[PDB]
Design an enzyme around this catalytic site. Structure first.
Site, PDB file in Angstrom:
ATOM      1  N   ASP A  35      12.642  34.989   0.478  1.00 34.42           N
ATOM      2  CA  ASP A  35      11.994  35.825  -0.526  1.00 34.42           C
ATOM      3  C   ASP A  35      10.723  36.418   0.026  1.00 34.42           C
ATOM      4  OD1 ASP A  35      11.017  36.985  -2.767  1.00 34.42           O
ATOM      5  OD2 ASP A  35      10.539  35.097  -3.804  1.00 34.42           O
ATOM      6  N   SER A 199       6.055  54.598  -0.352  1.00 38.03           N
ATOM      7  CA  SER A 199       7.148  55.534  -0.064  1.00 38.03           C
ATOM      8  C   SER A 199       6.642  56.965  -0.253  1.00 38.03           C
ATOM      9  CB  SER A 199       8.334  55.239  -0.977  1.00 38.03           C
ATOM     10  OG  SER A 199       9.334  56.194  -0.881  1.00 38.03           O
TER      11      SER A 199
END
EC number: 3.4.23.22
Length: 330
Positions: A35, A199
């Site tokens: 994770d 992004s």
């Protein structure tokens, strides 16, 4: 040193991935959920409340000649899905894919929430976010990656998740055979303890690319892609009959649909998520309403590039003094 381990979807939907991990001496192999959005290595154990264990493999420290109680240390964690676990702490030898760390904090669960109990395939979590998020008190502990780092050939790990297929976690090297083209690296902020990046924009299907900054985290422990409501609405508007359902808890779409792809930007590069990656199947067994793999982050407080996004890429988690993320097509 290096390590290389195969990671395997837990079910037919790629809800999560499990990676075998050797703990203790002799080894006890547990299947952990790696994770990148948390920083605790915790396991089902001989200490876990018996009614909260249903099929998991447990770690038994009393059977490990290298296990040592980390006296006084406790831990307690709550995840973004409302699940939680807590317990006490041992140090022990932990190996992943041939890479060994001695003295790793292994957080032994005394309690786990129902979602963990109900998932017999996951024996615990191995956190790969920054050690600043580790919940051990009163002495915070390091992640497996942070303890391995100085021994690695390069201070990196890579995630290569499969779509309906096994993939690979590598530690200490970048497998130049595992991706196509070049890797585009992008800056990371560690201020919140995550692999947080920005992004450069998105496209829906064959549509034009929208240049827009989307800050979010690279999180292997989250199944879906959670983005701003504007972006998500623009995606689902291209699917006839898709809608947001407050009863189901997100966007659903007719199972008869063919989904468009979704592209996200990494610098000037582009990662394309095929439409089929965005199909999470019937909302209940036999339903003709299917659950979408792109959902709004509006109720979370952060955007999350979960497995839907990451499995479309070869992803480099660069833990050098200035961390960065890299993405390549594959």
């Amino acid at each position: 040193s290096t390590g290389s381990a195969t990671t395997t979807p837990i079910d037919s939907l790629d809800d999560a991935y499990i990676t075998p991990v050797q703990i203790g001496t002799p080894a006890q192999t547990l299947n952990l959920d790696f994770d990148t959005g948390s920083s605790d290595l915790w396991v089902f154990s001989s200490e876990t409340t018996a009614s909260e264990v249903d099929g998991q493999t447990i770690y038994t420290p009393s059977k490990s000649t290298t296990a040592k109680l980390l006296s006084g240390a406790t831990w307690s964690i709550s995840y973004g899905d409302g699940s939680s676990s807590s317990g006490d702490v041992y140090t022990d030898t932990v190996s992943v894919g041939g890479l060994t760390v001695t003295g790793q904090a292994v957080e032994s669960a005394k309690k786990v929430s129902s979602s963990f109990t109900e998932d017999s395939t996951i024996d615990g979590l191995l956190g790969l976010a920054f050690s600043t998020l580790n919940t051990v008190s009163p002495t915070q502990q390091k992640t497996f990656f942070d303890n391995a780092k100085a021994s690695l050939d390069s201070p990196v790990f890579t995630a290569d998740l499969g779509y309906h297929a096994p993939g690979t976690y590598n530690f200490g090297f970048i497998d130049t055979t595992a991706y196509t083209g070049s890797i585009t690296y992008t800056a990371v902020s560690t201020k919140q303890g995550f692999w947080e990046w920005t992004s450069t924009g998105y496209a829906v299907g064959s549509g034009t690319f929208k240049s827009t900054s989307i800050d979010g985290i690279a999180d292997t422990g989250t199944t879906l892609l959670y983005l701003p409501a504007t972006v998500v609405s623009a995606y689902w508007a291209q699917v006839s009959g898709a809608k947001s359902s407050s009863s189901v808890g997100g966007y659903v779409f007719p199972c008869s649909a063919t989904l468009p792809s979704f592209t996200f930007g990494v610098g000037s590069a582009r990662i394309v998520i095929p439409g089929d990656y965005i199909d999470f199947g019937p909302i209940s067994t036999g339903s003709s309403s299917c659950f979408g793999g792109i959902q709004s982050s509006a109720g979370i407080g952060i955007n999350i590039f979960g497995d839907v996004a990451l499995k479309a890429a070869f992803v480099v988690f660069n833990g050098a003094t200035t961390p960065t993320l890299g993405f390549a097509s594959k």
